[PDB]
Design a protein around this ligand. Structure first.
Ligand SMILES: *C(=O)CCCCCCCCCCCCC
Ligand SMILES: *C(=O)CCCCCCCCCCCCC
Lengths: 604, 86, 41, 604, 41, 86
């Protein structure tokens, strides 16, 4: 049973309506199921432990028995009259609301009390590493004590109550074994209150540490089910939400990104220059679109973000072409009639809006750093919005210069300030971008081995690629973490892949002389580096031309392997290299024993 | 998907000025296209039979592949190189 | 908020209800139910 | 109860599992609930009637009692063990499958038998209108008979069995009253087997006809709930499906439709001519875009349809400008760089595809019809598809001419064949079009009083307007039909509106001298013509500038009135003008009595 | 078509099933149930 | 929705060759704009106060309306007529 206890308000006959939460002057009795007593007992148990320090310091008020907050009522206990009717409990143990209040504020008040002392006991305990993980190692007690008698700073609490803290301590450190009163010798065994827990944390030499290897697994299992690593290369529309894209604002360096390497950025590849004009704040400036191609951020295929083009440390040659100086650098949109990459001359450019200029010309924004005047780090920045560009077939964001007077000097300059580190930040997660279009769902499998070397590094913050990369990256840490894809152990991961290579290379051999019986020693090893190359750089699985990894099978395969692989690790997964791991722990205890030996001499 | 047309834009620019070359199956370069399989720039490598991208690095000496087929016009890029090799 | 009457023991627009958070009882149902292999059995 | 009968297969205790459809050598006994016996009895009853003709002609096989196909089993009868458990029926009347087969093929075999005779009886019966609808009117039997002894063609069956058909007849026509054997006189009352039914169909002078007025109502009620007339001016997205658009291919006459009168059709309003070229089938032709504006079907905002531009009977002046002759007329798409209505000269037009040319020049397609050579009726025709125009910001369908050689003669011609009757047929119902955009849902209330006089007649086959017109049209026939919106009876329809006008004109009077107390005699009459103008031309309610009808209240109001109005008509709704209607029926019976009077003399 | 077993009296992939229309029994559930005001009561 | 800009395109074309006739509340035409309410082409009719379309056709003697207010620039179309009336 569970929930609050109910009782037949109509008396005797208890039906699915003659019940009612048995409330009263104390609040409502909620049932205390077996396991929920484990907690409140485990919590109180950790407080009772500090008994010797509560009396010493006259705080506290006696040991806290959980049997002081409960009661022994009886009735039907459920979550609702209907279902509570199927849990007739007699003399169960319930805790009334007003009690659920004290057991709370008591464990809270006492928790402070101890939390404090417990902190002093520690700066003194750990102040001599009472924990080794291979074999033993003593340190003659006299010295030890006479030593901490020093180190411990005058405001601890282990100097005001030595054997009032010691008695608390003995129950937390199975290192300190108190000398028995009637034989005046230790005990071999150490009996700290955490008897079992402390036994099951020792780094057992057979397998690393059960508490470790156990969690590193349940931890990975969490992720595997959580983010949705499963279904990682699913071939079908998936809401961007399914990718929980967060804290995702990637930055670049356009005016370098080739147009074909990333759809969201077209260029004005035209013969001559395209000097246009525009009255901005009265003054008339001339946008240039200089000698080179001047790659500009396209506006369509640009998920309403927060574009913030930073222009700093980048050269600013106002020294040579004086034409450049005087011009306030500024991010400006450019609506063109004919599609760009077909826009020849000025009459082609519909209009030009200065979405964000920089007050003060190019001769105050400068700063000489050895001849080559740089740009005082400043951030121009628009706030592009999907629909502010409705209808408008062609429009481009360009972080240019806005020259107040074009001249012969700036005839080979080309004032694109795009060489600066632009940082787009998708401000509306629901919508992603792929191959130049804005969508609401991705098709994972499509984005695999479909980008090129740099059609990946040039991805646009929160676009399929960047999403089908953030995803693999989780799955990449589950294998990297739990599975042993980094040793000659032909693990579950590199194993799922090997079975694909076989089934694959086996049918490609079917029909024709079949002169080559499948290899296997070579297949195991080829798939080992395939699974390994993945854990290594999760990204690669997106680039066209990557051995194994990019065939449709793998990944879809890998994950579902790694999947079941985590759901069976056992507990002693740590047996892997638990030999050198062990031998390394003995190595430490031998060096730490060496320490105790000095504590033992210096302070005799 | 085959090639990714950014690759084919590197084919023609390596063929406008003929750099390419034609490698055979025994990883030796020839200029006849009849014994040759691999096609370089030397950015990208494509076997002429299956016509898929293989390795963005060249030195086709370090490429693994398993295909076998004959007849592959376009010879036109192959023909454009030897005209542009002068 | 139209009156209902019995469907549920409380009317919403009912007499003397009272929204009033208390730092003491942080509202919470049951999300973290453990089901992982080892822990569920 | 209903369904097949089940019985405890496990015996005695019948639980929700110890049951099982009691099947066997006869099939499965299905229960024959009370009403379902009404049908099979009503069906057999109509066959037994023909008893005298079955014996006469040695067919048949005795009267068909429905009690010959059933049985008297008993058990639990439901649709599934679970629910059949709650219908314990004892000695119910079930019909086994193999029986449900005969009662079927018997009623079918016999039905043919009678269907035939029953047809002969008729050509003879109705061959002297035995049905009047006001007062009576006889026709001395001798004459009548001695008359039909003539007319009836030699292959009837009423001449081979006179009083073998007569006996069948007497039970279907309460007009023929047989003379009683032991008093040798009629009976006043007529006792035809359809005693009741025939009594309740007579046009009762108090109210038209219960059978009529009853159905004309249930009929309207069907529609009202069906199509979804309710919610007719709902203000919120509604899937086009909710409008069941079918059999919907509207035709026009573009090159006349103003661009602003219908978004799906832009025009090349440019100064000079825009002669372009294109190699079509080798030969090079020149698309013209002549002197006038040449309105062309825009491609975007064009729901992938089946455009079929017919060019016939329309003038073809190859007589004057010889330039026109020789040019094969053809529907051609035109992709322009700069948006049309901004496309000045040839270099602006990206490309031109001849989506469908007409084989043979303009001098074989002609046909002289009094000087002015016309176009031999022929249909050019594309099959535009939403996505075949993906990306392509500007593209237009144009049914032009394709001149093989532009000349000075065709300098004021302008070869747009759009003056022809184009017929677009939406080939993909799911997607509609509104104000130039393609959507999947309409917002009804939005399309009311939002179109102009002709922003309606220029609507594009299966576009919101055409949908929010097909809808009102149903609701327009429900009122037109059921409700009396065509008499001074201030009906429920014109009444729902009057209450809106009041509540409306009443608050517009609130605040300020209120010198005008609402009218009402004038309001009733104004709303009467408003509801009337609607029934009249349902469309109007879409045009901006229509008195009353176009205020947001009405319609949303009207329908919900007309709604409840139909759900209460009573049965005697026919009482409306049931006076002149009655007086007109007596008028007919007086003229029909006049007929019987001649049948009575001529054939004595 | 994976075997079930009891949920329903028939397996789909079950032994000797048989798709076979007969002009005699035109398959039909119950769509035209009458509910109109006068007719439902 | 007010105007329906196909109506306003008929305003300017009737005022760029001024045919616009300004009518008062007593359904008489004047040329002063101060006493006038109704504005014609003569296709469309708009009361200058509320500025909504009233009748597709002209001849404002047959229009019902109930609005009352004052001055309404644009007088610019009214000013453009008398210049274009010459
Ligand atoms: C009647 O429904 C009027 C609206 C009042 C309550 C509607 C929902 C908003 C309040 C929620 C109460 C339940 C938990 C939020
Ligand atoms: C297992 O599910 C394999 C698929 C076989 C049946 C799936 C559905 C198609 C057949 C329908 C049977 C029920 C009525 C159509």
């Amino acid at each position: 049973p569970t929930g609050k206890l109910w009782r037949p308000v109509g008396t005797s006959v208890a039906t699915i309506d003659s019940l009612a939460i048995v409330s009263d002057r104390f609040g409502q009795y909620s049932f205390v199921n077996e396991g929920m007593r484990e907690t409140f007992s485990k919590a109180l148990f950790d407080i009772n432990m500090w008994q010797p320090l509560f009396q010493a310091t006259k705080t506290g008020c006696g040991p806290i028995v959980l049997s002081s907050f409960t009661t022994t009522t009886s009735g039907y206990v459920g979550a609702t009259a209907g279902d509570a009717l199927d849990n007739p409990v007699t003399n169960g143990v319930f805790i009334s609301t007003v009690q659920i209040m004290n057991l709370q504020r008591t464990i809270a008040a006492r928790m402070r009390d101890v939390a404090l002392w417990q902190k002093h006991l520690d700066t003194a305990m750990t102040m001599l590493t009472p924990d080794i993980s291979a074999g033993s190692a003593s340190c003659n007690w006299k010295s030890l004590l006479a030593f901490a008698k020093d180190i411990l700073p005058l405001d601890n609490l282990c100097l005001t109550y030595p054997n009032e803290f010691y008695n608390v301590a003995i129950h937390r450190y199975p290192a300190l074994k108190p000398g028995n009163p009637d034989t005046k010798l230790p005990d071999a065994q150490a009996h700290p209150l955490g008897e079992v827990a402390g036994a099951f944390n020792a780094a057992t030499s057979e397998v690393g540490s059960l508490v470790g290897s156990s969690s590193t697994l349940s931890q990975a299992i969490s992720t595997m089910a959580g983010k949705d690593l499963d279904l990682i290369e699913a071939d079908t529309p998936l809401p961007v939400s399914v990718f929980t894209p967060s804290l995702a604002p990637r930055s670049y360096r356009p005016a370098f990104i080739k147009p074909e390497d990333a759809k969201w950025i077209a260029e004005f590849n035209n013969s001559s220059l395209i000097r246009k004009t525009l009255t901005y704040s009265g003054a008339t400036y001339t946008v240039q679109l200089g000698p080179g191609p001047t790659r500009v951020i396209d506006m369509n295929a640009m998920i309403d973000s927060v574009l913030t083009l930073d222009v700093s440390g980048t050269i600013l040659p106002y020294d040579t072409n004086p034409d450049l100086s005087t011009s306030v650098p500024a991010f400006v949109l450019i609506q063109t009639s004919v599609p760009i990459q077909q826009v020849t001359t000025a009459a082609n450019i519909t209009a030009i809006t200065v979405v964000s200029a920089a007050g003060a010309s190019a001769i105050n924004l400068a700063i000489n750093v050895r001849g080559q005047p740089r740009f005082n780090m400043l951030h121009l920045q628009a706030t592009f919005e999907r629909e502010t560009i409705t209808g408008i077939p062609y429009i481009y964001g360009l972080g240019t210069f806005l020259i107040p007077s074009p001249t012969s000097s700036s005839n080979f300059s080309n004032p694109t300030l795009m060489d600066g580190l632009l940082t787009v930040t998708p401000v509306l997660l629901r919508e992603t971008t792929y191959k130049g279009e804005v969508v609401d769902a991705i098709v994972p499998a499509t984005v695999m081995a479909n980008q090129t070397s740099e059609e990946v590094a040039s991805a646009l913050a929160n676009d399929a690629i960047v999403l089908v990369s953030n995803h693999l990256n989780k799955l990449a840490n589950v294998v990297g973490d739990a599975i042993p894809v980094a040793s000659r152990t032909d693990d579950s991961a590199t194993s799922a892949i090997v079975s694909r290579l076989a089934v694959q290379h086996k049918l490609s051999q079917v029909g024709q002389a079949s002169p080559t019986p499948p290899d296997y020693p070579l297949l195991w090893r080829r798939a080992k580096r395939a699974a390994s190359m993945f854990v290594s750089n999760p990204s690669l699985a997106l680039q066209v031309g990557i051995p194994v990894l990019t065939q449709s099978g793998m990944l879809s395969a890998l994950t579902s392997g790694v999947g079941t692989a985590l759901r069976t690790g056992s507990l002693g997964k740590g047996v892997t290299d638990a030999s050198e791991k062990l031998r390394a722990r003995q190595s430490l205890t031998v060096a730490k024993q060496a320490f105790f030996d000095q504590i033992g001499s210096l302070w005799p | 998907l085959h090639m990714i047309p950014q690759v084919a834009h590197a084919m023609v620019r390596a063929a406008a000025a003929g750099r390419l070359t034609l490698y055979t199956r025994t990883r030796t370069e020839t200029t006849n296209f009849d014994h040759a399989e691999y096609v370089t720039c030397g950015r990208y490598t494509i076997c002429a039979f299956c016509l898929t991208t293989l390795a963005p690095h060249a030195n086709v000496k370090t490429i693994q592949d398993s295909h076998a087929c004959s007849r592959q016009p376009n010879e036109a890029i192959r023909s454009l190189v030897e005209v542009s090799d002068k | 908020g139209n009156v209902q009457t019995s469907v549920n023991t409380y009317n919403i627009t009912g007499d003397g209800n009272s929204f009033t958070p208390t730092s003491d009882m942080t509202s919470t149902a049951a999300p973290a139910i453990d089901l992982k292999p080892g822990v569920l059995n």
